[PDB]
Design a protein around this ligand. Structure first.
Ligand SMILES: Nc1nc2c(ncn2[C@@H]2O[C@H](COP(=O)(O)OP(=O)(O)OP(=O)(O)O)[C@@H](O)[C@H]2O)c(=O)[nH]1
Ligand SMILES: Nc1ncnc2c1ncn2[C@@H]1O[C@H](COP(=O)(O)OP(=O)(O)CP(=O)(O)O)[C@@H](O)[C@H]1O
Ligand SMILES: Nc1nc2c(ncn2[C@@H]2O[C@H](COP(=O)(O)OP(=O)(O)O)[C@@H](O)[C@H]2O)c(=O)[nH]1
Ligand SMILES: CCNc1nc2c(c(N3CC(=O)Nc4cc(OC)ccc43)n1)CCC2
Ligand SMILES: [Ca+2]
Ligand SMILES: [Mg+2]
Ligand SMILES: [Mg+2]
Ligand SMILES: [Mg+2]
Lengths: 437, 55, 427, 320
């Protein structure tokens, strides 16, 4: 057993971290006070769920997590919420004033004051690990803290944990729910500085989650609670192999091995199905073929794009529920004949499949209905570069006039980092188009 | 399609399907240096403001 | 946490400042004695932004009252909410400024400015984490214009990393006290260009036109003008005072509204436009709120927004309404008038909704626009300045206080540079 | 109102479409790079499909199908027909073609040459009986195709021609064939290229602008060959258009996409001696005939644009 430490940065990372650990506890039978009756080894053990939970002598199961925000409002709700007993105070870290949607303020000005404290608290969790394998980092692209401080943390983690893997769950900015106009700046700045320090990053576009909540959950104006509960389900599907018995994606290294043959191209596309409204009185349950076919519809992807006009480098299928291999293969055989699935020439055309018999757990009182089978597809397709093209274009529009640049230069950042970061994204888009065409 | 590396446990099973074969960091010093270089650019700009206000 | 220190200087600054504290104390449930008697706890969640909590659970405004003569401040202490203010925070001289920027900035005001900073320091040292300052003042007089900008310069010297925000009332010959108001306003505008992060341009020309043309008030009083000011000030501070999805502060407002440091002068708007006393029996639909909120007749700065382009826009909707209908109507305004929004700032319109409506209105909307059309305001003042300055008329009031003509020439050029900088991004 | 942007200044078809939209009074034109549009008349090269459908509160439509270039380039059309089972290597209405680089199929073409041996070589032109002759011209990507040595010849004149058909595919992937085609004739008697530009280099001895329309051509088929245009030619044309577009529909359809697409195509057909129709190429950005610009462009607004953005039949729907 090898432990994984989760790190949640900024408002988006903290609130999504709240949804994930709430869902983790329900899936493993962990009550809000940390007790887990089904765990017959009191005080320790090397079970698969111990990857995410340590154990005290009194039988409390404590998440291997640290929450950090430069302003206390969001984490204070963790300190007083339903799962307040779950975390000890040392893993909840708050500053006094935030980064004001400014990357340079979170990376340089404020981040320099708090980075050593955060690493010291991360070191406390790592000391409890007999074989730490790496970190899962949750943050947004658009926030000053989620962008600026995360890139500084990722730099120091490579220094202090050189042989450790680091995975991201990143929230791609969408204007429909964002309240900052400079999020293209922060996204490009944080992607450039973090690119060499992240082994695998799962981008989640708020635009896609917002439209999935409107379309399939019949929620007219989805809130962050709506989005994060859905995001937590997809994240749980991705991390289930680290927390349950199995043979696929059993350590963080296997994520890069199975999904990322090119280091810079480490942004797999996540697709999820089925998303069924809990208010739906009468629902006919979907088959293995129908949910597998839904993995190739853009309306179910975490990032809206057209994989038909790209190329696959890897593809995983993560099923939860009543699923047997012969029905997956029958579904893949039909989908291969009807859909445009083109792999790169230097890759085998195939699917790595993982099935967990336990159906997805849904939070009681939530929007998601219980289903008998669900699937999350992780596909490294060059079509995800469409999101880089959108973001870099918005960057180019503002930066051509140097609009808002003075806020970043005023925090000690040099203007050259803007174009240095933009040029790295230009190379990234070129890399995708070389592989995809 | 070839089904390979089938592993079964009580919680589920995993395998791999192949349709077709293929068709063919900065040190701690450097981090601390850039962080302090940005701080001095801040302290310089603050010094110019206080000089401007003194005038 | 996120405390704001309020300062009101001069006659106008104290009259609109007193009305501001009257209105928001009613919205938060604070009575004239500082005791809370409300019904919802949303009134208290962010009450610390503007109020200190004293013994006995009294709520005392974090406000400082400044003037060079006692007249207006004695009437404030006599006013309806005059007893809610900390008596130590009344800082006043005896000589007055005589509508003379030089007296407020260099002679009479310098004697008193250190006493004001002592009260500022006392309030700031009690703040858990000070955001910055908001100042209410006029630009046409002597105290709020001259001493107010001297205060801003010294506050920035002592708190260089804090946000400075002002509600600045622009003079207008339609509502004019003296002929030297263009002199005082031009001198003050340069100070605001250098030493504030955000300035709400509150134009007495627009306030008069709204009262006369829209509200059909034949003889508008300062009470009629301040009814529009207090409704606007309540709206623009809604997201600072009440919890919501946004939870905004002064710094995040400046970062997202100001793409270039000197262009931080905002056009405020409000809907529905109401006269004092007259009641609103039917509430506005969300389409009606959105249409009026962007209408030039609702702007508190006498500028035609169709003569320029919107750099950034912030909108606040207050009341029980469909948030989906707000998004559709706001997206409709941008999608059907896209040429008036600069294309090099994507998605430059942000909207917030607050369930708590202001007093006497079931639904309201407040507009905060950073438009290049604000140059028409500084142009109007520049023309009135030049008309007198080309003959050095009325300068002896200022040279008698030690000022030289060169300082007027510099202030004139500084504001013209500001005008051409706004013209730069309008093309 | 509705808003649209124009990003192809050289398009004669959509320059007229813009006119008709403005004359409606319910369409407003924006600057090229304004993202707040309902309709994009996009550029022909590197159209940014990845930036469409991401504007909140705007249904967005574009006049091009992403991925339709596979059908509209000489090299990729041959590969599409050879490798698609719907069209297959036994396709009876596409001439024997081989892709040749200056995978490649030189050896397969030579096995066809050694096994009338007149071929044509073209790209995005040389007619020779010897493979090395036209091949050395290539190296001096091209496609080598069997030249139809026995074409249908109009009389009087003993003249060769090709048939241009305009096809509109809307956002619902309805296939509309414009009822008016045109024959682009040669004014020189055939001697064992019908491009309009080449003919302006006789020209219009027989018809105005070397263009014979369907009413005259049908009347000729009745007087000369005792048949009609519908029976002898149009059934095959409608079958070929249907087969080509139904083949690539799964690859280019925008049915469940965040943006929508339509596109106007120009199919070029050749009719041989026995009234057998051969597809020559598909043009993805075709122009129209001057007489037909008004009717067709108005039909584009009605069928492809106003169907998505309604306001306050000249097509034959090819069903599938
Ligand atoms: N899905 C999701 N997105 C969020 C959430 N909270 C914020 N965001 C997104 O994150 C972006 C803003 O970043 P934040 O995380 O809120 O800001 P921050 O990281 O705390 O950084 P600062 O507040 O500027 O110091 C916006 O685009 C939001 O849409 C959330 O709870 N769920
Ligand atoms: N296999 C073939 N057999 C006989 N003639 C052929 C032929 N292929 C092409 N041609 C002749 O060559 C002429 C031009 O060829 P082609 O159609 O490929 O060029 P092009 O792309 O300029 C026409 P457009 O662009 O308008 O579709 C055709 O009009 C036809 O008369
Ligand atoms: N809107 C408004 N403007 C005022 C008020 N009182 C004064 N003014 C304006 O302020 C200018 C005079 O400055 P004033 O504040 O009275 O002098 P000060 O005491 O030295 O600051 C003139 O342009 C007046 O029109 C008021 O109550 N409301
Ligand atoms: C006095 C501060 N009250 C405030 N009220 C509102 C907004 C706002 N802010 C701050 C922010 O956090 N985002 C933001 C983005 C933006 O983009 C152009 C414009 C303005 C803001 N502040 C937006 C809606 C109402
Ligand atoms: Ca145990
Ligand atoms: Mg934050
Ligand atoms: Mg006065
Ligand atoms: Mg062609």
């Amino acid at each position: 057993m090898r432990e994984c430490i989760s790190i949640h940065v900024g408002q988006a990372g903290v609130q999504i971290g709240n949804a994930c650990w709430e869902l983790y506890c329900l899936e493993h039978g962990i009550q809000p006070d940390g007790q887990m009756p089904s765990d017959k080894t009191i005080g320790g053990g090397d079970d698969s769920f111990n990857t995410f939970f340590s154990e005290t002598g009194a039988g409390k199961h404590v998440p291997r997590a640290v929450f950090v925000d430069l302003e206390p409002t969001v984490i204070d709700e963790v300190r007083t919420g339903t799962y307040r007993q779950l975390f000890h105070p040392e893993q909840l870290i708050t500053g006094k004033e935030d980064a004001a949607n400014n990357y340079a303020r979170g990376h340089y000005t404020i981040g320099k004051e708090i980075i050593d404290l955060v690493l010291d608290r991360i070191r406390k969790l790592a000391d409890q690990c007999t074989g730490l394998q790496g970190f899962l980092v949750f943050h947004s692209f658009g926030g000053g803290t989620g962008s600026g401080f995360t890139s500084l943390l990722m730099e120091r983690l490579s220094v202090d944990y050189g042989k450790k893997s680091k995975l991201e769950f990143s929230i791609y900015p969408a204007p429909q729910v964002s309240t900052a106009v400079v999020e293209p700046y922060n996204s490009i700045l944080t992607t450039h500085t973090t690119l060499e320090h992240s082994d695998c990053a799962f981008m989640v576009d708020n635009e896609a989650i917002y439209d999935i909540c409107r379309r399939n959950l019949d929620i007219e104006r989805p809130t962050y609670t709506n989005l994060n509960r859905l995001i937590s389900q997809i994240v749980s599907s991705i991390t289930a192999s680290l927390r349950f018995d199995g043979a696929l994606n059993v350590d963080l290294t296997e994520f890069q091995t199975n999904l990322v043959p090119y280091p810079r191209i480490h942004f797999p596309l996540a697709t999820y199905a089925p998303v069924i409204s809990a208010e739906k009185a009468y629902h006919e349950q979907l088959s293995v073929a129908e949910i597998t076919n839904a993995c190739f519809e853009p309306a179910n992807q975490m990032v809206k794009c057209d994989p038909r006009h790209g190329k696959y480098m890897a593809c995983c299928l993560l099923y939860r529920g009543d699923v047997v291999p012969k029905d997956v293969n029958a579904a893949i055989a039909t989908i291969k004949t009807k859909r445009s699935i083109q792999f790169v020439d230097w890759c085998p055309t195939g699917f790595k499949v993982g099935i967990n018999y336990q159906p997805p757990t849904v939070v009681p009182g939530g929007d998601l209905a219980k289903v008998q089978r669900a699937v999350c597809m992780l596909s490294n397709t060059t079509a995800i570069a469409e999101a880089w093209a959108r973001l870099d274009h918005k960057f180019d529009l503002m930066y051509a006039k140097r609009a808002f640049v003075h806020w970043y230069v005023g925090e000690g950042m040099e203007e050259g980092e803007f174009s240095e970061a933009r040029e790295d994204m230009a190379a990234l888009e070129k890399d995708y188009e070389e592989v995809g065409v | 399609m070839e089904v390979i590396e089938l592993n079964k446990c009580t919680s589920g099973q995993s395998f791999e399907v192949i349709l077709k074969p293929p068709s063919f960091d900065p040190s701690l010093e450097e981090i601390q240096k850039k962080l302090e270089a940005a701080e001095e650019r801040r302290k310089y700009q603050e010094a110019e403001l206080l000089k401007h206000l003194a005038e | 946490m996120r405390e704001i220190v309020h300062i009101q200087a001069g006659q106008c600054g104290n009259q609109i400042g007193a009305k501001f504290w009257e209105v928001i104390s009613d919205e938060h449930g604070i009575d004239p004695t500082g005791s809370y008697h409300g019904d919802s706890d949303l009134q208290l969640e962010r009450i610390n932004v503007y109020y200190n909590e004293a013994t006995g659970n009294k709520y005392v405004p974090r406000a400082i009252l400044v003037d060079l003569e006692p007249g207006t401040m004695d009437s404030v202490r006599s006013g309806p909410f005059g007893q809610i203010f900390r008596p130590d925070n009344f800082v006043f001289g005896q000589s007055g400024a005589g509508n003379n920027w030089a007296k407020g900035h260099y002679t009479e005001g310098a004697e008193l400015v250190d006493s004001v900073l002592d009260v500022v320091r006392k309030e700031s040292e009690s703040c858990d984490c000070l955001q910055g300052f908001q100042l209410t003042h006029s630009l046409g007089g002597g105290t709020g214009s001259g001493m107010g900008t001297l205060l801003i310069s010294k506050i920035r010297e002592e708190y260089p990393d804090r946000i400075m925000n002002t509600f600045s009332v622009m003079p207008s010959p339609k509502v004019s006290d003296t002929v030297v108001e263009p002199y005082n306003a031009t001198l003050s505008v340069h100070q605001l260009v250098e030493n504030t992060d955000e300035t709400y341009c509150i134009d007495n020309e627009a306030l008069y036109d709204i009262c006369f043309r829209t509200l059909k008030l034949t003889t508008p009083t300062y009470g009629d003008l301040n009814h529009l000011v207090s409704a606007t000030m309540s709206g623009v501070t809604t997201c600072l005072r009440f919890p919501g999805q946004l939870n905004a502060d002064l710094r995040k407002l400046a970062v997202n509204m100001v793409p270039f440091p000197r262009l931080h002068f905002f056009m405020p708007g409000f809907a529905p436009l109401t006269s004092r006393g007259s009641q609103q029996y039917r509430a506005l639909t969300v389409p009606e709120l959105t249409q009026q909120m962007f209408d030039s007749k609702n702007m508190m700065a006498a500028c035609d927004p169709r003569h320029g382009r919107y750099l950034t826009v912030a909108a606040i909707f207050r009341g029980r309404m469909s948030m989906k209908e707000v998004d559709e109507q706001m997206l409709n305004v941008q999608n059907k008038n896209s040429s008036y929004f600069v294309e090099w700032i994507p998605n430059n319109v942000k909207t917030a909704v607050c369930d708590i409506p202001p007093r006497g209105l079931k639904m309201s909307a407040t507009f905060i626009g950073n438009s290049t059309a604000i140059q028409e305001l500084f142009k109007r003042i520049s023309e009135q300045f030049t008309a007198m300055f080309r003959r050095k008329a009325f300068l002896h009031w200022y040279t008698g206080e030690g000022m030289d003509e060169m300082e007027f020439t510099e202030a004139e050029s500084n504001m013209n540079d500001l005008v051409s900088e706004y013209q730069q991004y309008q093309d | 109102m509705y808003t649209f942007v124009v990003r192809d200044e050289n398009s004669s078809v959509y320059a007229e479409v813009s006119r008709l939209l403005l004359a409606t009074g319910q369409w407003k034109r924006l600057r090229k790079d304004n993202p707040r549009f309902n309709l994009m008349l996009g550029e022909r090269n590197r159209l940014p499909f990845g930036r469409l459908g991401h504007e909140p509160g705007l249904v967005q439509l574009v006049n091009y199908y992403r991925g339709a270039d596979k059908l509209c380039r000489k090299a990729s059309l041959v590969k599409l027909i050879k490798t698609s089972p719907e069209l297959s290597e036994s396709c009876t209405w596409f001439p024997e073609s081989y892709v040749i680089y200056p995978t490649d199929e030189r050896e397969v073409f030579l096995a066809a040459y050694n096994r009338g041996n007149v071929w044509i070589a073209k790209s995005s032109i040389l007619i020779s009986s010897e493979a090395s002759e036209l091949l050395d011209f290539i190296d001096e990507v091209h496609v080598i195709q069997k030249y139809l040595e026995k074409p249908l010849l109009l009389e009087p004149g003993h003249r060769k021609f090709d048939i241009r058909s305009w096809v509109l595919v809307d956002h619902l992937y309805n296939i509309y064939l414009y009822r008016e085609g045109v024959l682009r004739t040669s004014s020189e008697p055939y001697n064992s290229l019908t491009n309009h530009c080449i003919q302006k280099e006789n020209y219009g001895r027989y018809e105005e602008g070397n263009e014979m329309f369907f009413e005259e051509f049908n009347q000729y088929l009745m007087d000369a060959l005792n048949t009609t245009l519908e029976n002898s030619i149009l059934l095959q044309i409608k079958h070929i258009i249907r087969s080509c577009l139904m083949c690539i529909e799964p690859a280019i359809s925008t049915k469940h996409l965040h943006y929508q697409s339509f596109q106007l195509f120009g199919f070029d057909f050749m009719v041989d001696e026995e009234l057998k129709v051969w597809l020559i190429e598909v043009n993805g950005a075709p122009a129209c005939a001057q007489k037909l610009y008004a009717e067709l462009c108005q039909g584009i607004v009605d069928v492809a644009i106003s169907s998505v953005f309604p306001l306050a039949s000249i097509f034959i729907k090819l069903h599938h």
